[PDB]
Amino acid sequence: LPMPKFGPLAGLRVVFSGIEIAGPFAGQMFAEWGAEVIWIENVAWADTIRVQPNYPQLSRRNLHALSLNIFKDEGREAFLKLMETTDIFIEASKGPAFARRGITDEVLWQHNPKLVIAHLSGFGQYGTEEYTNLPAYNTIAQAFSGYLIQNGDVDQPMPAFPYTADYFSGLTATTAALAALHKVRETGKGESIDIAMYEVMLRMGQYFMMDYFNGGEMCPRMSKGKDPYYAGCGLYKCADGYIVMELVGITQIEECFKDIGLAHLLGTPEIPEGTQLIHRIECPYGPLVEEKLDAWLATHTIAEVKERFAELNIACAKVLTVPELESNPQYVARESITQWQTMDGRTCKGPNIMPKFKNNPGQIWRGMPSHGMDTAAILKNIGYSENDIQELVSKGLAKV
């Protein structure tokens, strides 16, 4: 298919079947970085992402759109033919749904024995009958992994937002699919990858959970965005807004304590000389430290705190609101937010390609395609005639 040659993944052919965030995010990252990526949609039912007015202009850029019933008659035949030239196939579904509909890994490999197959599900491709076939979204994966219980305030759990587990899960699928592709180059043999969203999020939530599994206690939740375990770390209110800070280091603690009126705690059994990080659970002065930190920060503007904290080498940042990003100097210098043209000729603003590859940078070469926009070109490219395509369309097995 016609497109510019760019990025580390030029020449790669990637196909995904899935909707909304997780599966499509996995596939579309390949497209940010140069790959030929094909988005499969159902014929009567488009990806529900298309209901959002702006997000998909970002989340479906650089893609080719195919609309095909991949499970019926000529539709299935065209899908399996497509697999013959495909390097990586990503599918998101409820457990082993493809296998239930006749498309097993074995069937895919009969068409391409080198195929990397990434299966993204909520609960895995195997397990128990109770959980394996359950529908999952982000919130379910957070709940089921112990991630949700660690987010929110002391007395109110909540999910991490927006849709955090969907992005972790998609990104993991991209990572694993690339690692599998690497091995194909040596062995000439494909691979199947079982990415369960709850196992993804299980791993992301281990920092303190590992204490629970190994004799210790679990950590409590944050109190108003303050770290549950480390004093002077996390979210604080200044006179004119929010900041984050990380009170870490010997001199940092001593200078900060001088400023806030707690020099007299320094060099005591509770806070000995050379302390570099205050453990709030262990420390009986934890609450006093937070009281005096809050009081000092409350009487100073963000700018004054940043100036002082720079003198003291204390890490901090203003909590930026969305309207402050586009004019921020670092964003401007790095072109972190850019613009591109949609398919219908309108200017769209959003994040540039990330990360920045020095020798082979990504680029935005196409806006989001419409439903079935490239069906005819894709089918022609894999050997269908104009007549064949019209007959698929007339049976309702494809949409152009």
Place this chain on the structure above:
Amino acid sequence: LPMPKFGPLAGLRVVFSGIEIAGPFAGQMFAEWGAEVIWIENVAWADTIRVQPNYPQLSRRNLHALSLNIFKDEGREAFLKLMETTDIFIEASKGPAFARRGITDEVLWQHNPKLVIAHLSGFGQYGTEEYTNLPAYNTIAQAFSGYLIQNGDVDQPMPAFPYTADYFSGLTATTAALAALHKVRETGKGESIDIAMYEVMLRMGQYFMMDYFNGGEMCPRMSKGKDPYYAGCGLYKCADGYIVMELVGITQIEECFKDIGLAHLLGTPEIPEGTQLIHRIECPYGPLVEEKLDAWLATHTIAEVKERFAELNIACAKVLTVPELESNPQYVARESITQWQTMDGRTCKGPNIMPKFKNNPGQIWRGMPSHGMDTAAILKNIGYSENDIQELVSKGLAKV
């Protein structure tokens, strides 16, 4: 170096320089999947991760440990020699610190023109003098990217937890490094990757931010864990505790409305037949749906609701606490939590390898190594004599 042959990344040589979560997570993931990974630490002090009693047993498993001053004299020479047989080098530091210390990308490529170099920083490798050389922290990246302001409750922002940005940034570096490695295999030319943590997190926070960038409004924060825009989605209370649900789909909405007392809303101009999602602010009955949902869930147990939503194909799950995971049927069936031996002979419990590769699964072959445990074997492997190694040690440039 001696180790079992397994996984998709068998044979790959990866080296990382960094401490704590973000850069080491990127490196260690290669080790989960079969790569030879060398963890560099300083000589007279170690990675600060080691202070944590349990987590490092997970976050540094399957690793080899090198203690070497890579920037000074014969230590720099030994590091640049190591690069000659390294496929991927990952480093986390404050902006272009390696370049300031004398090791530019050009110097690395003089030793290995194929080298994939992943540079992980808070604010990127270039930009403004004000921000580029600032410290990298999870809280700062969330603050600076607009991620933090979206998390939390209506009148209380908070970071996503635990240290969510470090994991996203590390995982991205792994993905990007594997993409660049694919390009090396095609062209023979190495690559330098500039992973700015704030740009990673910017992308993960776009679902609603894209509305702001293109003429619309930014979305509010969740209220007690309920989605800010979609009704029937997020955190709810049953008679005996918390669940999450996602009220999504045509039949799902119909059947749920019937159960909760809103059958009379169906097939009207406000809720047309075939409605798949309730937009809580656009729908005049959004608040009514939440009232009726809350009331129905309150009179039923978690088991009762799970059963009904299984019937209706409505995604839900109990919000699991950490003590509930190990005995959960899906966790048991999939061995999602397993056990292994530490290097000093104790049993450690924690997550298994994820994801599950069918043909070439990962495995746990080694506990976390001690400080400089493999220094002598690594240096010997790249051609240093017994006496050369002792000289490095005497000069304080290496630790064995």
